[PDB]
Write a protein that binds this DNA or RNA. Sequence first.
RNA 1: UUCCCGGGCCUUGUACACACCGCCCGUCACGCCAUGGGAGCGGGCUCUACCCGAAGUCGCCGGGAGCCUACGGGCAGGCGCCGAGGGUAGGGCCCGUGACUGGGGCGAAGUCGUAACAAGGUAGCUGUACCGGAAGGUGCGGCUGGAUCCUUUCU
RNA 2: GGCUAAUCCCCCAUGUGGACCCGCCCCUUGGGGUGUGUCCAAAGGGCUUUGCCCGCUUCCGGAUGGGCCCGCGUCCCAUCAGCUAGUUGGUGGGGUAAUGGCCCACCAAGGCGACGACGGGUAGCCGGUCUGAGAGGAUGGCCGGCCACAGGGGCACUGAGACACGGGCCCCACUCCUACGGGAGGCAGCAGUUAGGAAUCUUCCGCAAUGGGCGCAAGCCUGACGGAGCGACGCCGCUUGGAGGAAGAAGCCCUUCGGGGUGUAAACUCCUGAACCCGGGACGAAACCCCCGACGAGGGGACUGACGGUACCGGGGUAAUAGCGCCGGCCAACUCCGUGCCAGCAGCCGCGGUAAUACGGAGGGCGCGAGCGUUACCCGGAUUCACUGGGCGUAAAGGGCGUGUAGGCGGCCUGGGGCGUCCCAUGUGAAAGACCACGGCUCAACCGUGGGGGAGCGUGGGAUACGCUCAGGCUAGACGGUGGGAGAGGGUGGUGGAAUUCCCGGAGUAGCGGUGAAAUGCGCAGAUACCGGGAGGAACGCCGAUGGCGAAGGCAGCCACCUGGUCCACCCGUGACGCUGAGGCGCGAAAGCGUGGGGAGCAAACCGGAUUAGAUACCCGGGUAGUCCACGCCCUAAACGAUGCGCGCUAGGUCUCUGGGUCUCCUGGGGGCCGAAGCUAACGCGUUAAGCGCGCCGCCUGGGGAGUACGGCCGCAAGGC
Lengths: 124, 138
Amino acid sequence: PTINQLVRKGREKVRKKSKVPALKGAPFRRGVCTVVRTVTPKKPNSALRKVAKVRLTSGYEVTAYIPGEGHNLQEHSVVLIRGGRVKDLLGVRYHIVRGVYDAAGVKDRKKSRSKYGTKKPKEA
Amino acid sequence: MLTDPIADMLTRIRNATRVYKESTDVPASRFKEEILRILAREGFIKGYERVDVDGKPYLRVYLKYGPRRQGPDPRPEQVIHHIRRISKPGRRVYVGVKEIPRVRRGLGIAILSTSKGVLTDREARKLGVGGELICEVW
RNA sequence: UUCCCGGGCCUUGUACACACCGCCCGUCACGCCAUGGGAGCGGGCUCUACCCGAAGUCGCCGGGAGCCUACGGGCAGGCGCCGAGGGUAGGGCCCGUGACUGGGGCGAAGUCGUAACAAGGUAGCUGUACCGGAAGGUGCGGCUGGAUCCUUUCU
RNA sequence: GGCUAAUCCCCCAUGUGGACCCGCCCCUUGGGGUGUGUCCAAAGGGCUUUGCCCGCUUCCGGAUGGGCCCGCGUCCCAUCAGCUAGUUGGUGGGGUAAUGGCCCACCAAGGCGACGACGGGUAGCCGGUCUGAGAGGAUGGCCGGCCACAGGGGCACUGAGACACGGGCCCCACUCCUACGGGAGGCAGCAGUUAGGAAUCUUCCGCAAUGGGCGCAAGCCUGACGGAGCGACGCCGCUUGGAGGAAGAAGCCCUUCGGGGUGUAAACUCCUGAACCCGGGACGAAACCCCCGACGAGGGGACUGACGGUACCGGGGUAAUAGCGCCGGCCAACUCCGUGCCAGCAGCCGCGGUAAUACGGAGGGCGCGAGCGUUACCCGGAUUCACUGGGCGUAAAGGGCGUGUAGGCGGCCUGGGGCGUCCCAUGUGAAAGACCACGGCUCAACCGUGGGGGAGCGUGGGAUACGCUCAGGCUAGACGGUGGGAGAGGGUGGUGGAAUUCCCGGAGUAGCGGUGAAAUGCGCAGAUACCGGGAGGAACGCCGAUGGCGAAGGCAGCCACCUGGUCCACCCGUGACGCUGAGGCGCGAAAGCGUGGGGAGCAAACCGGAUUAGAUACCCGGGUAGUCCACGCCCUAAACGAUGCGCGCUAGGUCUCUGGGUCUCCUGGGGGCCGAAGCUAACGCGUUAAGCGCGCCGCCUGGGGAGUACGGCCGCAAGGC
Ligand SMILES: [Mg+2]
Ligand SMILES: [Mg+2]
Ligand SMILES: [Mg+2]
Ligand SMILES: [Mg+2]
Ligand SMILES: [Mg+2]
Ligand SMILES: [Mg+2]
Ligand SMILES: [Mg+2]
Ligand SMILES: [Mg+2]
Ligand SMILES: [Mg+2]
Ligand SMILES: [Mg+2]
Ligand SMILES: [Mg+2]
Ligand SMILES: [Mg+2]
Ligand SMILES: [Mg+2]
Ligand SMILES: [Mg+2]
Ligand SMILES: [Mg+2]
Ligand SMILES: [Mg+2]
Ligand SMILES: [Mg+2]
Ligand SMILES: [Mg+2]
Ligand SMILES: [Mg+2]
Ligand SMILES: [Mg+2]
Ligand SMILES: [Mg+2]
Ligand SMILES: [Mg+2]
Ligand SMILES: [Mg+2]
Ligand SMILES: [Mg+2]
Ligand SMILES: [Mg+2]
Ligand SMILES: [Mg+2]
Ligand SMILES: [Mg+2]
Ligand SMILES: [Mg+2]
Ligand SMILES: [Mg+2]
Ligand SMILES: [Mg+2]
Ligand SMILES: [Mg+2]
Ligand SMILES: [Mg+2]
Ligand SMILES: [Mg+2]
Ligand SMILES: [Mg+2]
Ligand SMILES: [Mg+2]
Ligand SMILES: [Mg+2]
Ligand SMILES: [Mg+2]
Ligand SMILES: [Mg+2]
Ligand SMILES: [Mg+2]
Ligand SMILES: [Mg+2]
Ligand SMILES: [Mg+2]
Ligand SMILES: [Mg+2]
Ligand SMILES: [Mg+2]
Ligand SMILES: [Mg+2]
Ligand SMILES: [Mg+2]
Ligand SMILES: [Mg+2]
Ligand SMILES: [Mg+2]
Ligand SMILES: [Mg+2]
Ligand SMILES: [Mg+2]
Ligand SMILES: [Mg+2]
Ligand SMILES: [Mg+2]
Ligand SMILES: [Mg+2]
Ligand SMILES: [Mg+2]
Ligand SMILES: [Mg+2]
Ligand SMILES: [Mg+2]
Ligand SMILES: [Mg+2]
Ligand SMILES: [Mg+2]
Ligand SMILES: [Mg+2]
Ligand SMILES: [Mg+2]
Ligand SMILES: [Mg+2]
Ligand SMILES: [Mg+2]
Ligand SMILES: [Mg+2]
Ligand SMILES: [Mg+2]
Ligand SMILES: [Mg+2]
Ligand SMILES: [Mg+2]
Ligand SMILES: [Mg+2]
Ligand SMILES: [Mg+2]
Ligand SMILES: [Mg+2]
Ligand SMILES: [Mg+2]
Ligand SMILES: [Mg+2]
Ligand SMILES: [Mg+2]
Ligand SMILES: [Mg+2]
Ligand SMILES: [Mg+2]
Ligand SMILES: [Mg+2]
Ligand SMILES: [Mg+2]
Ligand SMILES: [Mg+2]
Ligand SMILES: [Mg+2]
Ligand SMILES: [Mg+2]
Ligand SMILES: [Mg+2]
Ligand SMILES: [Mg+2]
Ligand SMILES: [Mg+2]
Ligand SMILES: [Mg+2]
Ligand SMILES: [Mg+2]
Ligand SMILES: [Mg+2]
Ligand SMILES: [Mg+2]
Ligand SMILES: [Mg+2]
Ligand SMILES: [Mg+2]
Ligand SMILES: [Mg+2]
Ligand SMILES: [Mg+2]
Ligand SMILES: [Mg+2]
Ligand SMILES: [Mg+2]
Ligand SMILES: [Mg+2]
Ligand SMILES: [Mg+2]
Ligand SMILES: [Mg+2]
Ligand SMILES: [Mg+2]
Ligand SMILES: [Mg+2]
Ligand SMILES: [Mg+2]
Ligand SMILES: [Mg+2]
Ligand SMILES: [Mg+2]
Ligand SMILES: [Mg+2]
Ligand SMILES: [Mg+2]
Ligand SMILES: [Mg+2]
Ligand SMILES: [Mg+2]
Ligand SMILES: [Mg+2]
Ligand SMILES: [Mg+2]
Ligand SMILES: [Mg+2]
Ligand SMILES: [Mg+2]
Ligand SMILES: [Mg+2]
Ligand SMILES: [Mg+2]
Ligand SMILES: [Mg+2]
Ligand SMILES: [Mg+2]
Ligand SMILES: [Mg+2]
Ligand SMILES: [Mg+2]
Ligand SMILES: [Mg+2]
Ligand SMILES: [Mg+2]
Ligand SMILES: [Mg+2]
Ligand SMILES: [Mg+2]
Ligand SMILES: [Mg+2]
Ligand SMILES: [Mg+2]
Ligand SMILES: [Mg+2]
Ligand SMILES: [Mg+2]
Ligand SMILES: [Mg+2]
Ligand SMILES: [Mg+2]
Ligand SMILES: [Mg+2]
Ligand SMILES: [Mg+2]
Ligand SMILES: [Mg+2]
Ligand SMILES: [Mg+2]
Ligand SMILES: [Mg+2]
Ligand SMILES: [Mg+2]
Ligand SMILES: [Mg+2]
Ligand SMILES: [Mg+2]
Ligand SMILES: [Mg+2]
Ligand SMILES: [Mg+2]
Ligand SMILES: [Mg+2]
Ligand SMILES: [Mg+2]
Ligand SMILES: [Mg+2]
Ligand SMILES: [Mg+2]
Ligand SMILES: [Mg+2]
Ligand SMILES: [Mg+2]
Ligand SMILES: [Mg+2]
Ligand SMILES: [Mg+2]
Ligand SMILES: [Mg+2]
Ligand SMILES: [Mg+2]
Ligand SMILES: [Mg+2]
Ligand SMILES: [Mg+2]
Ligand SMILES: [Mg+2]
Ligand SMILES: [Mg+2]
Ligand SMILES: [Mg+2]
Ligand SMILES: [Mg+2]
Ligand SMILES: [Mg+2]
Ligand SMILES: [Mg+2]
Ligand SMILES: [Mg+2]
Ligand SMILES: [Mg+2]
Ligand SMILES: [Mg+2]
Ligand SMILES: [Mg+2]
Ligand SMILES: [Mg+2]
Ligand SMILES: [Mg+2]
Ligand SMILES: [Mg+2]
Ligand SMILES: [Mg+2]
Ligand SMILES: [Mg+2]
Ligand SMILES: [Mg+2]
Ligand SMILES: [Mg+2]
Ligand SMILES: [Mg+2]
Ligand SMILES: [Mg+2]
Ligand SMILES: [Mg+2]
Ligand SMILES: [Mg+2]
Ligand SMILES: [Mg+2]
Ligand SMILES: [Mg+2]
Ligand SMILES: [Mg+2]
Ligand SMILES: [Mg+2]
Ligand SMILES: [Mg+2]
Ligand SMILES: [Mg+2]
Ligand SMILES: [Mg+2]
Ligand SMILES: [Mg+2]
Ligand SMILES: [Mg+2]
Ligand SMILES: [Mg+2]
Ligand SMILES: [Mg+2]
Ligand SMILES: [Mg+2]
Ligand SMILES: [Mg+2]
Ligand SMILES: [Mg+2]
Ligand SMILES: [Mg+2]
Ligand SMILES: [Mg+2]
Ligand SMILES: [Mg+2]
Ligand SMILES: [Mg+2]
Ligand SMILES: [Mg+2]
Ligand SMILES: [Mg+2]
Ligand SMILES: [Mg+2]
Ligand SMILES: [Mg+2]
Ligand SMILES: [Mg+2]
Ligand SMILES: [Mg+2]
Ligand SMILES: [Mg+2]
Ligand SMILES: [Mg+2]
Ligand SMILES: [Mg+2]
Ligand SMILES: [Mg+2]
Ligand SMILES: [Mg+2]
Ligand SMILES: [Mg+2]
Ligand SMILES: [Mg+2]
Ligand SMILES: [Mg+2]
Ligand SMILES: [Mg+2]
Ligand SMILES: [Mg+2]
Ligand SMILES: [Mg+2]
């Protein structure tokens, strides 16, 4: 462009959309399972995936994914939403944080435990 | 018209030298004469001349290159390795004394046009003036 | 040596490369899903005209209509301008809702053809126009990003 | 309704002075000085009581704090393009500490906007902070500054000061009291409650310090403030031990069953001595006051500590918490089971469908450690908005073409000025912060003292090369005179032959047409094939080109007029008149639209004949709009060189169109091909640039959704932008 073009019109700073309305800019948001169920994934993958439609303190009703190996959630469990998404099925913008509110943590998990929210076990 | 006199000077030189010409006419100006005086004393051109072609004033600019290269491509090393305009008609550039660049690690020069007249970065700096920055050479 | 089958060498076009048994386009139906378009309905803000208009300052009367008085004047009080705000009628914004509703996804390539890519088997593409279950055909211009000099689908 | 005091309110005098109207002096916006008239002062109280202290009064300064006003700076949307009636100015007046339409009365008709007015959305600004090589981006919690608010909206009063958070009034909403008449509130002060939320503390101590109000002082008030508490919220310091200790124990993992691993790790041995206990114990505090002097200077004396029996010091003393993420590649870290597209992982490539370093557990390892992960948000990478620092022939991207408006840009020489620009001095650039230096807490974090740097703006002074500007001059750009060209450049009147179809006539006999084959069709009402005449419409063979013109679109028989552009010669005239161009305006293949004409061939739609599984097609027969003209709309395109215009510089060779030339050839201007330098991702481009450069305009910023929706504008409509 010329200079006189940059003085005339000049460059355009461009902004970016959010990958999520957990709204608030909130780091997490509380919700209530409205319904819970199992879904089929996408492209190359097969599976039965675990998820819950959740109604929000932010007012929107969204689909979040229940991480890890078992779970306890049903009609109106209440749960916390953190977001981060699942590529392989769609409409899921957010994960459930396991171990908060009415959602249990995955029990027996020895290995990586902060994620999955399981307490440290003792022994002899 | 000719929108930058000067640019076109520098360019003539450039395409001139790239094609290894022994020298070149450029259309004449008191200023463009200063600039080559600087450019010359400073080592880059063999020197120049005030000529007249077809009844019109020109400056011949004689032209220097380094010695004959070996192996394939014997074309000799350029002296004027690079020359480029800085201030440009409708976009101008004027620099404080503290803002005068210094060039290719000092291995080249800048040409400034000041109210001390036309001089190199080093000259300006010791003079202590700033000005329009005409060109990068190295 | 034209053709059928397989094959070699040169070349050419390709959107094919598990490589022509390759690749591909469009229409339908019923679920089911988010999205978007949207009359009417409810809410909000705003602007214009008109009318009612608190507090208060400012104006004016302040009267054998009240109180004080050196009779100069003051105060009560009264009337007016403005005026928060309301009301009635109109535009405009924004929100919520919403009958009806275009395209997208999965249900399952399911269906009907074969439009394009090799001269894709009528070269393709394009603006425009009319037709047509559907890709589409066709007319008129135009471009080359066009091979070489009967029709016969689909894997 | 009634008494009553004052530093409360009046009246009279004094007038240092001040105030106001008028006149002159100086000065320059309402600044001083001065004269004439007029108008204006006051308050007492205490003592060591006749002279001191705390007060009052009028004036002139200082100081500090403010009002008001100007230049400049100060987010997104043009799918917000017009806005304005106190609007913009003027005279007079109101009002105020003061200017001003702040308001008001009457005059004038102005003010503002693409240099983005009006509208919409969003937001307290700043010192600074975060990030970044930098340039930039992003941010404004804490501390300082400035503004605004005090449940929502109006208003004024008192006052030096307010239109006042714990003052007043009214309306509204809400809460509470109520004899239903009428009343009372305002934590966005500190604590604390509740609600909301992923989430944010003690109804603590103190008035010792600092600071503020009042007070002659004593003192009083001070949820400002100094301190303590709670939260790994951050930052910093420190601990869970140090030296020994095997050819290397059990357990556990791997195993090619020999051995490998955890691992000097443990055990054990020997030092030290976090925690904890004892003792001692601050600085932060020295003035106000009091005494001598003189209530000064100066000297002497006295009191006072929330934090706290804390910091610190000395003695004694115990071997005394470790966790979290990772180990497929980006990326440091591998093996065995389990599992079998499941269960699961997943930031992205992607893992899992029976030998998974990728899921899950194990052993081992890597990284950090009182922390380690996660999600969220900013900057980075991202040169992916490109000022530094990108692009547009095919990748996204040159407008369809032209004319010029605003605007950007501007040959050669001389002189003036000195606005841009450069320099010097100076003022400002508070403190905090950042940088450096010493220093204080045992270190550090944290804190002090000092030093340095600084863009920017104000002022004075200076330089004049470049930019501007004014004056002069020149001719290499531009234009003009004269002369010589070529051309499907454009508008209008005109005419000419060939062929098609039809009408007429002649002769003339059974088929013609058509295809892959054929049917449909036309033919004895005599077609095809031939000759003659006529009518009518459209288009222009050969020349004709790998040619020419034109800005594009586009333009072909011949003649006449009307008229555009352009090239070469001569070097004659002007004297920089130049380039580009948002917007605007005008052109703009075809198809399409409106009204009127025209209609030979051709032909969407249509109507039939074939082919085919079907054939809404390709082939055949026929045919309407339309194609042609006129006027008016429409405004698109593979509107292609998929390459904006202009200017200058950088080998050649060959072919060609058109000029001039002392005519193997030279010299301009077009059209082509090959190619030097160089450019490109390559293909290619290459003096007709895609090379080297400057000016100016248009344009792009992953694919799809979509050239869709929505809004505006255009249009008769189709539809365009
Ligand atoms: Mg650029
Ligand atoms: Mg898979
Ligand atoms: Mg439950
Ligand atoms: Mg993430
Ligand atoms: Mg828990
Ligand atoms: Mg994991
Ligand atoms: Mg400077
Ligand atoms: Mg064969
Ligand atoms: Mg062979
Ligand atoms: Mg190939
Ligand atoms: Mg086939
Ligand atoms: Mg669904
Ligand atoms: Mg909707
Ligand atoms: Mg809907
Ligand atoms: Mg309504
Ligand atoms: Mg009224
Ligand atoms: Mg009376
Ligand atoms: Mg009276
Ligand atoms: Mg009045
Ligand atoms: Mg009124
Ligand atoms: Mg009103
Ligand atoms: Mg709505
Ligand atoms: Mg659908
Ligand atoms: Mg799709
Ligand atoms: Mg499907
Ligand atoms: Mg086709
Ligand atoms: Mg198509
Ligand atoms: Mg096809
Ligand atoms: Mg075809
Ligand atoms: Mg065909
Ligand atoms: Mg077409
Ligand atoms: Mg058709
Ligand atoms: Mg065609
Ligand atoms: Mg093609
Ligand atoms: Mg061809
Ligand atoms: Mg053939
Ligand atoms: Mg099929
Ligand atoms: Mg009384
Ligand atoms: Mg006097
Ligand atoms: Mg007097
Ligand atoms: Mg008196
Ligand atoms: Mg008094
Ligand atoms: Mg003084
Ligand atoms: Mg002052
Ligand atoms: Mg002051
Ligand atoms: Mg001031
Ligand atoms: Mg008026
Ligand atoms: Mg008004
Ligand atoms: Mg006035
Ligand atoms: Mg007007
Ligand atoms: Mg902001
Ligand atoms: Mg706000
Ligand atoms: Mg830094
Ligand atoms: Mg950047
Ligand atoms: Mg910065
Ligand atoms: Mg800011
Ligand atoms: Mg706060
Ligand atoms: Mg602050
Ligand atoms: Mg201020
Ligand atoms: Mg308010
Ligand atoms: Mg206020
Ligand atoms: Mg409140
Ligand atoms: Mg209020
Ligand atoms: Mg007072
Ligand atoms: Mg006042
Ligand atoms: Mg108030
Ligand atoms: Mg309060
Ligand atoms: Mg009240
Ligand atoms: Mg509070
Ligand atoms: Mg709650
Ligand atoms: Mg606190
Ligand atoms: Mg207390
Ligand atoms: Mg105190
Ligand atoms: Mg004090
Ligand atoms: Mg005092
Ligand atoms: Mg005393
Ligand atoms: Mg009190
Ligand atoms: Mg405190
Ligand atoms: Mg907590
Ligand atoms: Mg905690
Ligand atoms: Mg915290
Ligand atoms: Mg062992
Ligand atoms: Mg062993
Ligand atoms: Mg040891
Ligand atoms: Mg020992
Ligand atoms: Mg010991
Ligand atoms: Mg003691
Ligand atoms: Mg002390
Ligand atoms: Mg002391
Ligand atoms: Mg005191
Ligand atoms: Mg005291
Ligand atoms: Mg004494
Ligand atoms: Mg005394
Ligand atoms: Mg003393
Ligand atoms: Mg003393
Ligand atoms: Mg104590
Ligand atoms: Mg003790
Ligand atoms: Mg000790
Ligand atoms: Mg000891
Ligand atoms: Mg131990
Ligand atoms: Mg030990
Ligand atoms: Mg790393
Ligand atoms: Mg590795
Ligand atoms: Mg299983
Ligand atoms: Mg197995
Ligand atoms: Mg297998
Ligand atoms: Mg296995
Ligand atoms: Mg496998
Ligand atoms: Mg593994
Ligand atoms: Mg992994
Ligand atoms: Mg693993
Ligand atoms: Mg482990
Ligand atoms: Mg630490
Ligand atoms: Mg953290
Ligand atoms: Mg980012
Ligand atoms: Mg960078
Ligand atoms: Mg790029
Ligand atoms: Mg370009
Ligand atoms: Mg393409
Ligand atoms: Mg393109
Ligand atoms: Mg073009
Ligand atoms: Mg185009
Ligand atoms: Mg143009
Ligand atoms: Mg132009
Ligand atoms: Mg101009
Ligand atoms: Mg010049
Ligand atoms: Mg001069
Ligand atoms: Mg200047
Ligand atoms: Mg001078
Ligand atoms: Mg200052
Ligand atoms: Mg500073
Ligand atoms: Mg520095
Ligand atoms: Mg130190
Ligand atoms: Mg510091
Ligand atoms: Mg300093
Ligand atoms: Mg300084
Ligand atoms: Mg700095
Ligand atoms: Mg600075
Ligand atoms: Mg300065
Ligand atoms: Mg001078
Ligand atoms: Mg200019
Ligand atoms: Mg002149
Ligand atoms: Mg002549
Ligand atoms: Mg002529
Ligand atoms: Mg002649
Ligand atoms: Mg002619
Ligand atoms: Mg012609
Ligand atoms: Mg002609
Ligand atoms: Mg003609
Ligand atoms: Mg006839
Ligand atoms: Mg006959
Ligand atoms: Mg006959
Ligand atoms: Mg027959
Ligand atoms: Mg026929
Ligand atoms: Mg017929
Ligand atoms: Mg017949
Ligand atoms: Mg018949
Ligand atoms: Mg007969
Ligand atoms: Mg007949
Ligand atoms: Mg018949
Ligand atoms: Mg006969
Ligand atoms: Mg006949
Ligand atoms: Mg005839
Ligand atoms: Mg006719
Ligand atoms: Mg005729
Ligand atoms: Mg041609
Ligand atoms: Mg053309
Ligand atoms: Mg002519
Ligand atoms: Mg001419
Ligand atoms: Mg001449
Ligand atoms: Mg002349
Ligand atoms: Mg002359
Ligand atoms: Mg234009
Ligand atoms: Mg047209
Ligand atoms: Mg047409
Ligand atoms: Mg028509
Ligand atoms: Mg007609
Ligand atoms: Mg026909
Ligand atoms: Mg048919
Ligand atoms: Mg077939
Ligand atoms: Mg048929
Ligand atoms: Mg036909
Ligand atoms: Mg019609
Ligand atoms: Mg039609
Ligand atoms: Mg252009
Ligand atoms: Mg000749
Ligand atoms: Mg040429
Ligand atoms: Mg080369
Ligand atoms: Mg380049
Ligand atoms: Mg070439
Ligand atoms: Mg060029
Ligand atoms: Mg290129
Ligand atoms: Mg991009
Ligand atoms: Mg997209
Ligand atoms: Mg379109
Ligand atoms: Mg819109
Ligand atoms: Mg529309
Ligand atoms: Mg309309
Ligand atoms: Mg269309
Ligand atoms: Mg257009
Ligand atoms: Mg267009």
